[PDB]
Paper text:
The Mycobacterium tuberculosis trifunctional enzyme (MtTFE) is an α2β2 tetrameric enzyme in which the α-chain harbors the 2E-enoyl-CoA hydratase (ECH) and 3S-hydroxyacyl-CoA dehydrogenase (HAD) active sites, and the β-chain provides the 3-ketoacyl-CoA thiolase (KAT) active site. Linear, medium-chain and long-chain 2E-enoyl-CoA molecules are the preferred substrates of MtTFE. Mtb is capable of switching its metabolic preference during the latent stage of infection in order to utilize host-derived fatty acids as a source of carbon rather than glucose or glycerol. The Mtb genome encodes an unusually large set of enzymes of the β-oxidation cycle; however, only a single trifunctional enzyme (MtTFE) that catalyzes three of the last four reactions in the β-oxidation cycle is present in Mtb, in contrast to other bacteria such as Escherichia coli, which has two TFEs.
The seven fragments M-10, M-49, M-76, M-79, M-80, M-92 and M-109 share a common substructure of a sulfonic acid functional group connected to an aromatic ring. The sulfonate groups of these seven fragments bind in the same region of the ECH catalytic site, but the aromatic group is bound in two different ways, such that for M-10, M-49, M-76, M-79 and M-109 it overlaps with the mode of binding of the pantetheine moiety of the substrate, whereas for M-80 and M-92 it points towards the E3 region. For one other fragment (M-10), the electron-density maps also suggested that the fragment was modified in two binding events, being a dimeric form. Therefore, data sets of somewhat lower resolution are also informative and these low-resolution structures were also retained for further analysis.
Numbering used by the authors:
A (entry chain B): -14 to -9, 1 to 720
B (entry chain C): 2 to 223, 232 to 403
C (entry chain D): 1 to 224, 232 to 403
The structure:
Amino acid sequence: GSSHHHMPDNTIQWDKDADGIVTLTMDDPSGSTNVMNEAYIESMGKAVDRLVAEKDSITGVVVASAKKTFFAGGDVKTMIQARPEDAGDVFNTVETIKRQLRTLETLGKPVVAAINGAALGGGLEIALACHHRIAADVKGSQLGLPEVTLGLLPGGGGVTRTVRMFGIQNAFVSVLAQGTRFKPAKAKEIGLVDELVATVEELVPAAKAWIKEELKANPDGAGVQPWDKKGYKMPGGTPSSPGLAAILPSFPSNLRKQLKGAPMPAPRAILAAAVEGAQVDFDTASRIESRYFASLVTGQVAKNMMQAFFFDLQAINAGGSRPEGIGKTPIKRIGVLGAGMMGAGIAYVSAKAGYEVVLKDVSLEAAAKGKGYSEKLEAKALERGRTTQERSDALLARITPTADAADFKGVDFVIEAVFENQELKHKVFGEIEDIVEPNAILGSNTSTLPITGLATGVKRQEDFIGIHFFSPVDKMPLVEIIKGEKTSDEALARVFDYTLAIGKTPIVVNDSRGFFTSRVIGTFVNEALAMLGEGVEPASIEQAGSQAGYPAPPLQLSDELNLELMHKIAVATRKGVEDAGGTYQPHPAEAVVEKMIELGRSGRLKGAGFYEYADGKRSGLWPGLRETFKSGSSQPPLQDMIDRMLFAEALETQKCLDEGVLTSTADANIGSIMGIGFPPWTGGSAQFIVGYSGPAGTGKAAFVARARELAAAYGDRFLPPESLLS
Amino acid sequence: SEEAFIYEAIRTPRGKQKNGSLHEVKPLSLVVGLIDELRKRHPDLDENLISDVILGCVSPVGDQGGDIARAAVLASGMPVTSGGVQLNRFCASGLEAVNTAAQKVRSGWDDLVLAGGVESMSRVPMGSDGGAMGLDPATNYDVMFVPQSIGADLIATIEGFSREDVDAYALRSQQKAAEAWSGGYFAKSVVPVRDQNGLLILDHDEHMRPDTTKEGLAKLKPGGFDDVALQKYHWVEKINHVHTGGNSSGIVDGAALVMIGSAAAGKLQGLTPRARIVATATSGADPVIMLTGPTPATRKVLDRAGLTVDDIDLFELNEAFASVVLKFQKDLNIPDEKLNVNGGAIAMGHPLGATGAMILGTMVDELERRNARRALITLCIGGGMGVATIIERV
Amino acid sequence: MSEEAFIYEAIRTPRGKQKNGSLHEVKPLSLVVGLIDELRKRHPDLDENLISDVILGCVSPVGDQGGDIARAAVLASGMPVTSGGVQLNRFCASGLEAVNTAAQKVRSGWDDLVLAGGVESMSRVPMGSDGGAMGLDPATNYDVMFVPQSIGADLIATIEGFSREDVDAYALRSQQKAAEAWSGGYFAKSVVPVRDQNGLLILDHDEHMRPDTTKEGLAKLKPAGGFDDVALQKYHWVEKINHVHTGGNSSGIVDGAALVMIGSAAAGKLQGLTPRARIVATATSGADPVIMLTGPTPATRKVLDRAGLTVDDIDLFELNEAFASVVLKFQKDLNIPDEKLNVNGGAIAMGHPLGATGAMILGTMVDELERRNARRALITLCIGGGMGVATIIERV
Ligand SMILES: Nc1ccc2cc(S(=O)(=O)Nc3ccc4cc(S(=O)(=O)O)cc(O)c4c3)cc(O)c2c1
Ligand SMILES: Nc1ccc2cc(S(=O)(=O)O)cc(O)c2c1
């Protein structure tokens, strides 16, 4: 009937001291972390039932954990399998979970959360059910509700209680909408945590001491949350309040402004559950939250985002592409060649990780201006207060700018960021390859030049490897590791471990012109340029890019990548295949590139492109663009433009998997999202195929029909490869 | 079957928003004064034939809540058998009350009906009733809620209306409203508002600025709604914001009454029919741009009555925004001398619930003055709707 | 009076109770959208562009029910943007008034197909949320002699001489006839169960009913600011008001919505729709606003004079069970037979969703006329402020 329960193993340990304080120690024996699994639901149901039974002999409850992490989310393995027909079970599961927490909450006696480590998602939802939260200010301790980042929403009372605690606007912006994780100090600052302790050993004693003092100082209000008292007033007011009702119609429009119209239903569902929940009582609000939760879990976007940002991202971090058996080799001195934006950013993220960096350029003045990129970055970090002056000085002190090739003495890790000329890169490596250590990694930050050709410029080709970064290096989280033919597996592992060391996500790519990121992002740019040549309005092309979910619209990106760079990229791919006796595959976007080069509008670096630029600031599209390409003469559906750019990247990704360029779909999904900004709601350019949804249906079969639908209308380049076909 | 005739059409002066003369007057008192004026003009009227009172009100809360129509029937001492119903179709609530009244008379089940609206925006501001399109995030995200002002600026951008274009129209409305007042056109219809002691409170449209100059309008000044509008209208790069407080409709208080009945009802009461409701129509357009509803509604009511633009002597569109009227004039190729000939809401104001009934009576008088035959009245509506009515002078 | 108005569909939601009701978590906009999607399921090939207006009754158009909830329903349900959408308020008869206006719009010839109905989520937007001049303005409250409906209902029982056992005997019959109707499956194809965004069931029955009601239980209930003095100042010949009305013999506070599809013969024939009933006549009248609830009797006589009919010509009488004495007075005035009056129960058992009531009891009579294979039915409601509305339908 209406129970605390939904074979499994016990997860909670029971302990009632002489004062009547029961200590519920969550300790899942089937893993290293407490997770809202079927074992927890049964274990918490047993403990809560015993709390109701022994209520006459219990004076307080303390919820603690025996793991290094308090409690980190739920069984994502289970929620990703929830089909639309399983919405009833999903609803009953979260209703049972919140029924247990609601009983623990309304127990008539204080309950304190002893947060020892990370309390994330469902874990923070357990602490929020308690009346008092004490956190241990320790390393790596995080608190937050990152449900939205998996296409879900806080369904275990997270949305209902954070709204009751901070109001609609504060709870949405600060905690719910972006799933922000907080350190224990910041968690106490915003109200998520009530007080802090230095070590984990003081937690449980302080929790029982607070219960001892709360019963003595507040006998009436003990074990009663603020929203359960008489005369509770929600901060900021309810939607019926005259103040909130004036600004409330601007919340969904602002959210659509942030999402840029991208089909992400999770933030919208959070704002709906937050507002609709504030209009009714707590229990009814909680049931509304359950229905929106079951709506997302059974939806396809959540399955895409759960696949990418939970399973795929863990499979990468677990060394899925790291060679087996290879051990760890420390990195003592990093030598960066070139002090451009790339080389300076490389030198920053390396020194930020604690490495000693020797930033070499042609001149001491150039190498000094490169270190200034880290100084102006530490300036903003010290201004907004993200780091201390103590460690900001130690960070810059690890960067040693130089112009002498002898200062690469003792370097066991070389990253090159000079301009992309083959003979140039061969000269730069030749004058340092004998100064550095004999086991030094020789890395290149090329974006198109094949690694096997660059490897001939050194004698230790087995240690030559491609280390492709993305600007700005201080913010872009992906590193494309390219494996040449001679690149050993040890060099692959050391660069793999280096990428994780600087706090970035690696993908391993076999050598091929264009690699994976540059090759796939070309199809995205080329589809837009095609559409412009076909006569589509330039504003519609940019809108189609933003509404697809991309961070930057394509024509705007086509100005940062420079059309002269795009021109010689197409000339190089043509010349290479032509020398092999074949017939190059020309793309219709090439005609639009050459037309813009002729008009003297080659991109942002020139100062004029598809947009007009003033004092280095973009200021609207070029008015002569419409007359040049007869804009308005072709008016296809916006969803066709959106699908033309998404499918182009999705089909090119499938080619890279067929050609062995990628070795795992996890590298393709994370590599597309974090490398070239593929929309996160898709779950990646590889997940988009199996997770496609439209009028043709859902799944790989619908993607194929829609690909053939686009192929008939816009060209056979949208024909699905043989692997996708049954 | 039956034919609907307008026997009377009066209205109150429109009191401005800031320091308005009608701010102290309850909206119920505005309607009761117009009811007493109808008794003054026809003391022989057997009010037992008045079968319903249909009032339009956009914010039916507070002073305007609890079926203000029924309150007006009881408070004014009308027979208890005279019904009383409040409706709401946003800006065209006044004209919808008239249309419904005419439709009830045509149905043969109603003999004599009072219709009109009331809106005391200084006491009950717009949006006070709440709403699901705005306050519910699940549906605000779906219907792409955008304020009417942005949809008006979007129209000016798409149609190529400059800042001088919308301001030149705003100057025209100010001049034609002053010309109509100084010409005594509004003498019979504008019923001055008085207190319980008979002392004068307001006898003119306070929102009018007849000393407006083109230079003064150019010195006027125009939360993510622009991005929401451009997400649907993806071919337009940027919205040119041209509308200011001088080229948009004013926020004013007021009320209007229209006595509609069958021929038999008017003959039995000795009433002289002034105009005949020829046809009405309700249509709509995209709710993001919102204010493009009048064009299909006007087109629909013209085909229903078997009439064309050439057969209409006077066009009366509510001047919610200057671009909405210029867009309407551009679409149907309306002559300049036929469009809002006595000024509009830009000069005199826009009392939401009562505007449809105000411009309706404004055309009844102007049809009799010019001795013209037909007039078409239409309004743009929030949510993308549109209402149009064709009257013929009898 | 040219075009004939026909009822093609008449559906409603189950009526969820006020205290811990199943529908308290459902927004009233969602209740209306649910009925729109049901009409789409029953007629998938219906060209919705023919639908020219959506008229919804709503007595408290505030909060969730403000901002033209009909237009919100048109936009949210994805109906054609040219389908209008207007909210009207005529107190308790707003639901029937929307149907009457929809039928009158069809008769005028300027509208072809109209959705009419009402919605009232009283557990979310309680009565009086809109304020009101007759109540909250002292100059008007003093003049109109404002008295709540319940006191006027007690006054009717005092004047006509209905005892506490009289009003409770009717309440028992309403609970019994409503339970018999549900058990017989009379409401099977008309009550559309409410579901959430996941398809999970929320409510599929009128949960305000108490089918185990007894005469003994009703007699134990207690009856429900000087309003008694105000009513007797006008009815000066009455000494003291006998308060006989309790929560058992009065209408219930419930949430719910109803939808009726009304159109011309050309509109239904073009869409392949089968007309279920025809609007014969409507009428609006009223009586004293202090007793308030004597409005149905003149409105019923007026609609019978307009259609050229008498009491004997009507097969089923359906009056909203606002209060038991109101129905007993209406039965006493016109000599209504017992076996013709509220044969499937009424608001005492199933509830009174203010904006949706008129459209609900209308759809009840369209179904009962077909089941009994009868011809005519007369639907009427008492209204606050002393008004009345009646309508006569005929099975086609
Ligand atoms: N000791 C630790 C403990 C946890 C660590 C997690 C990450 S992670 O952010 O990469 N993984 C994620 C990703 C999504 C999550 C969603 C939810 S949910 O509840 O919203 O479903 C809950 C989670 O815990 C999630 C964790 C990184 C670490 O270093 C960690 C270290
Ligand atoms: N014009 C109509 C319409 C409906 C009718 C129904 C019946 S019945 O309910 O006895 O079957 C009898 C009639 O004569 C009817 C005549």
